[PDB]
Amino acid sequence: SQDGTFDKLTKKEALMRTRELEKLENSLGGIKDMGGLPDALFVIDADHEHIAIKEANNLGIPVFAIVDTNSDPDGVDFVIPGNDDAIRAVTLYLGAVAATVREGRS
Amino acid sequence: GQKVHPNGIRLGIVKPWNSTWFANTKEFADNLDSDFKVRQYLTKELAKASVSRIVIERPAKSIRVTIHTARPGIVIGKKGEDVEKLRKVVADIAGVPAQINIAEVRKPELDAKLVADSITSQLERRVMFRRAMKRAVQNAMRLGAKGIKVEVSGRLGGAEIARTEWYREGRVPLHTLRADIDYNTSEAHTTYGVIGVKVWIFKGEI
RNA sequence: CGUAAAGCGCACGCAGGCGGUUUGUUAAGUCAGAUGUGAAAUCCCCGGGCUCAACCUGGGAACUGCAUCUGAUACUGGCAAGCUUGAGUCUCGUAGAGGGGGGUAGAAUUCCAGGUGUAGCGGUGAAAUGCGUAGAGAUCUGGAGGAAUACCGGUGGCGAAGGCGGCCCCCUGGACGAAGACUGACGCUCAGGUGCGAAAGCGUGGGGAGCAAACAGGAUUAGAUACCCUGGUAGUCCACGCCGUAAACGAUGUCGACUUGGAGGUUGUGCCCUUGAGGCGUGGCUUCCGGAGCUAACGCGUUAAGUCGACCGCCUGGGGAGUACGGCCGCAAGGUUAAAACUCAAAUGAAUUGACGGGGGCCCGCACAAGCGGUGGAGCAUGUGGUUUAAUUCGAUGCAACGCGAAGAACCUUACCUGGUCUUGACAUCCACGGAAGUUUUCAGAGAUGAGAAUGUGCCUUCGGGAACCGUGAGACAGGUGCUGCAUGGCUGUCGUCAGCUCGUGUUGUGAAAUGUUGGGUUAAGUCCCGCAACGAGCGCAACCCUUAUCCUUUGUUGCCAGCGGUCCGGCCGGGAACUCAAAGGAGACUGCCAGUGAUAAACUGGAGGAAGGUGGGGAUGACGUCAAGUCAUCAUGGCCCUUACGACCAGGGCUACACACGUGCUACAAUGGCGCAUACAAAGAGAAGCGACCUCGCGAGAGCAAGCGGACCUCAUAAAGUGCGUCGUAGUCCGGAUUGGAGUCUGCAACUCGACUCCAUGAAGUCGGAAUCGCUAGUAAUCGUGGAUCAGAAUGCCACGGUGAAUAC
C-alpha cells in the first residue's frame, strides 16, 4: 500500500484493496506485530468478552479480567471486581496496568 | 456428460495447436490423415520414452515433427540412430522428406499427458488408485502448479460397479479462459476393463 | 416408571412397614468370646504314594449354621419418666366460581295471540330441500316456557381429584395469616377395605326453549351410509338410584429434609416522615425464564426430572391382548382381576441430515396474466406405434423418444430377406514353393472361378535368395453392426446457465452432525456491504474469449469514387486516396460524473454527457451431483458366445409395405388476395471428377459450343415480399393444389419396386379447425426470400443469412 504498487492498473480494485486494509487493520490491529500467541491476556469485560476468556482458558493463558456484578469468574485466573463500562474507571484501570507493564528489568 | 474440453476452448486464447500447417481443401484431409498416421506410429513406438506432445508443421512439402518428451536420451539413444530411424519411417508414412526434433520436457510431473500416463501405468501394474492419484497430486503441487485435479473413473479396484473418485489441490479455474490449464487424458486397460484417467494442471493465470 | 414398558382417577384408613428428642433400666435384635454340634467323602491349602498325570491318601482349613453360657451397651427394639423444634387444639381476622338447599333478576332464542306491511326469506363455494301472498321474513305490543348465566374475567381463585362463574338468603367444609396459650410424638405411608369420581349410558317419575347422536330430505361426489345445507327423536335440564370410566394428564404416588438466581400474579401482615405512582421486611398459593446438578436427548430446574430418607403402586421385547376362559361386580352396556398356543426380529423414544406438505414467509422464469401467431380439422412431407411381410435391419420412448442416430435407403450405403457361393479366408502378421507385378482378349454364368497371346529381369546374390506383387498348402489365427450401456471408458441429454456445492483450521454437541453458508439490507448472482464462534479457501456467479453498436491510426488491390480531366456516359479510363468498405492495431462504458433515498455502507431511483448506461444486444462458457438416463451400432473395452459360421463374396428384393393411431412440419382455405405487365432495395455463403458466363437451339426442365474463376476479379445469381398499372369479384370461384393420364429432361451400369425436375391435361379435401395444446418480451413474434453441409442425383428437414416488421406486459 504505502510503498509499492497501489496506483497500478486499476482505481476501483485499488479502492477495494484499501478498504481491505481498513477491515484487516481494524480487526487485526494490535495483534499484527505479535508473531506468537501471548503469555497473558487482559480483558476489560468478562461477559462481553467471554469468547476470548474461553479460548485463553482453552490454551492455558492467564486471564486478567475486570469483572462487573453481571459477569462470571469463568476461568479468569486473576479476577478484579470493578466497573467495566465507565470510561473514568477503565482509563484509571488501564492506566495502572499499562504503568506496571512497562517496568521490565529495564 | 457436460464439460467442454479445456484445451479446445483455449485454442486461440493461450494454448497453441499441435498441427500448424496451412493447406487448401484438396490436401487438408490428406495432410490430416497423414498426421494421424505419424502420431499413431510415433505414439506406439515411443511408449517407454514418456512422450508429452508431438507437434506437426509442414513448411513447403516437408514435415517437421517435434517430439516434446521427458526422456530425450532414450528417444535419441547412443549416437542418434533412433532419431534417424524414426525420420526414416516418418518419411515413409508422410511421403515427404521428414525432419524431426526433440524438445525436452523438464519438470515432467507438471505435464498432464505424463501424469495421466503415469497413473495409467501404475493402475495396470495393479497398484491401488488412491496412492497413484494422491502421489500425483502431491508431487505435482510440490513444484509450482497453482492447481491440479486428477480424476480416475470406472470399476476401480476391480469392482462390479463403477465409481469416479477425483482429487484436487490448489486452484483449478476452469471457466476462466486465460487460465493456462494443461489438461490431458489416458486410458488404463486393466484386466477388469478400461479405467479413465483425466488430469487438469493449472499453471498460471495468463 | 415426564416422552421408550411402567405412578392406582383421587382420597380416608385397618392389618403391615417406618418413626423427632433427653435420661434411667432391660439386653430381644446387634457385637465379642467360650462350649456342644455342623458324619465321612467332595471343594480349598500344605505334604506323601502310584515313572508323571488323572487317581489314591496324611494333617489342616472350611462347612458362611444352630443351640447354650459368659460378657459389651453405641445403634434398633421393650419398659418407665420426660421435652419441644413434628402433629394437633383454642383466641382474632382474611380472601375465595369449595359444597348442599331455597329464592330472584336481566339480556337472548323458540312458541302463541294481535297491529303495521309486502314479495320474498333462509341457506351455500354455488345451489337445492325448507319456510312464504292461507301474508313469510322485517317490525312493534302482550304473554308462556325452558336452559344458560355476556361485561367483570385475568398462565385469576377455590377444591383431594372429578370439578366449581348472575345476584340474595339459609345450612356447611377447608385453607392462610398475627400474637399468645395448651396437649405433648398424639406422626408418615398404606396391601385388602371404604368413600368420592367429567362425559356418554341405564332405571323410575317430571320437564323439554335452544342444541343435537339416530333418522329423513337437499347437495357434493365415480360412489358419499360423510364433511356442507334444511328439518329432527333419544339425550342434554330436575329428583332419586345405578354405572364406574376418560389424553380422569403437571402422560410426573404420598410425606419430610437440604441445595445459586431473576421477573411477575394472588392473598395475609409488621415496621419505618406517607411527607409519590412511599420505603423496608416477613409468611401461603401460583406463572414464566434460567444456574449447578441430572437426563438418551428433549428438557426438569427451591412447586426438581438435583441431593437424600420412609412407605405404597406398577414395569420386564412387538403382536396375539388388556383379548379368551373362570371369579367378583353391574338392570344392561359393560367394569375389574387376568393367561396361553402361535408369530416376528424387531417394536420403541429423542434428536440429526434430507425430501415432501392441498404448512408459513420472501423471491424468480413466456410460468400465469396482457397480446400476437400457431397445433388439434383438410391434402401432402417425414418420423414413430401397430399391422403386414420372406424381410419389412438395429438403436432412441414421459418431460429429456417420435424429419431423433441418418449432414441426405435406386444399386452402393445395408447391418435384413431369398437364392448362388468361399473356408487361414474380403481385411492382417509370420512361413514354404512357384512366378516380376501389371496390361489388353474370348467363352459359361449373376459376379468371381476356368481357356489362351504378348509383356515379363523394377536392383543386388561362392547362387541355397532377397525388394514389390499374385497364386498354392498347413496353421497359430483373422473376422463378428453377435449378447450384456445393470461390468466399463469416452462422448451426450437432463434438472439448469438453476445459484448453488463443498473443504481446511477452530468451536459447539455423547453422537449423527452444526457453524461458516444463518441474520439486516441489496443483487442478475452465497453479488456486495454490515453483523456475527468463526477465520479462511476451492468449484460455481462476475471478468478474461468471439461477435455486434461509435470513433481514430495504418495499408488501399480485385474493393471505393468526394474533388479533378475528357469520356464510347458504364468507375469506363487517366487519376484520387477523402468516403463506404476490407482487415490489423488502438480508444471507448467502469455507477466514471451530478442530484436524491439509504447503517455517513452496499446499493437503488432519476439526470447530464455519449454511438452505447448500467451484467448495452447475442453467443461461447453448463458447479457437486441426479436419473444403475442414452450409446457395446462411431470408436475403445471386461466377460460370454459363433469361428466350413452369428465370418466372407455376389445378384435380386427390403428398409418406400398399409384397415389404422400419434408426433413434428409444409401447403392451403383467399380480395391485407389470385393472375399478367413493368420496376426498386440485401446479407451470408460455395466452387476444380467443381461453379460453369456469353451466344445458338428447346414452350420448359434442359442441350450444344464454351470464356472466366481455385476465386473481395469469374460463376452459382434474377432476391422475394415491396411498389405502379390492369383484371378477377365473393363464387368452391382466375382460391387451393392433391390425385391421375400422356409427353419428356437430367444424374447414374441401371429411376419397375424406388428419383428429382419440366410441359399438356385432370382439378380432390379444404370456406379457419371439437376437447385440448404450443411458441414468442424487440429487430422478437409474424411474414418474405437466399445460401450451405451431406450429396452422381435426390429437402417441405437441419444449419446459416438477410428484407419488411408488430401487439402486449395492470
Neighbour count for residue B36 (Cβ, 10 Å): 10
- The answer to whether some atom of strand C lies closer than 7 Å to the beta carbon of B8 is no
How buried is A35 (Cβ within 10 angstroms: 0-12 exposed, 13-18 middle, 19+ buried)?
A: exposed
Å separating the CA of residue B169 from the C1' of nucleotide C532: 30
C-beta within 7 A of nucleic chain C, residues 33-72 of A: 51, 54-55, 58
Q: Which three cell numbers stand for residue B165?
A: 473418485
Please name the amino acid found at residue B41: Y
Mention every residue, 6+ apart, whose C-beta is less than 8 A from residue A90. A44, A66, A83, A84
First-to-last CA distance in chain B? 28
B9 CB less than 7 Å from any atom of strand C: yes
Structure-block grid coordinates of residue B37: 498416421
* 8 A C-beta contact, residue A41 and residue A58: no
Q: Name residue B54's amino acid.
A: I
User: Is residue B197 within 8 Å of B136, Cβ to Cβ?
Assistant: no
Cα angle B78, B83, B86 (rounded to 5 degrees) comes to 135
- State the resolution, in angstroms: 4.0
Question: What experiment produced this structure?
Answer: cryo-EM
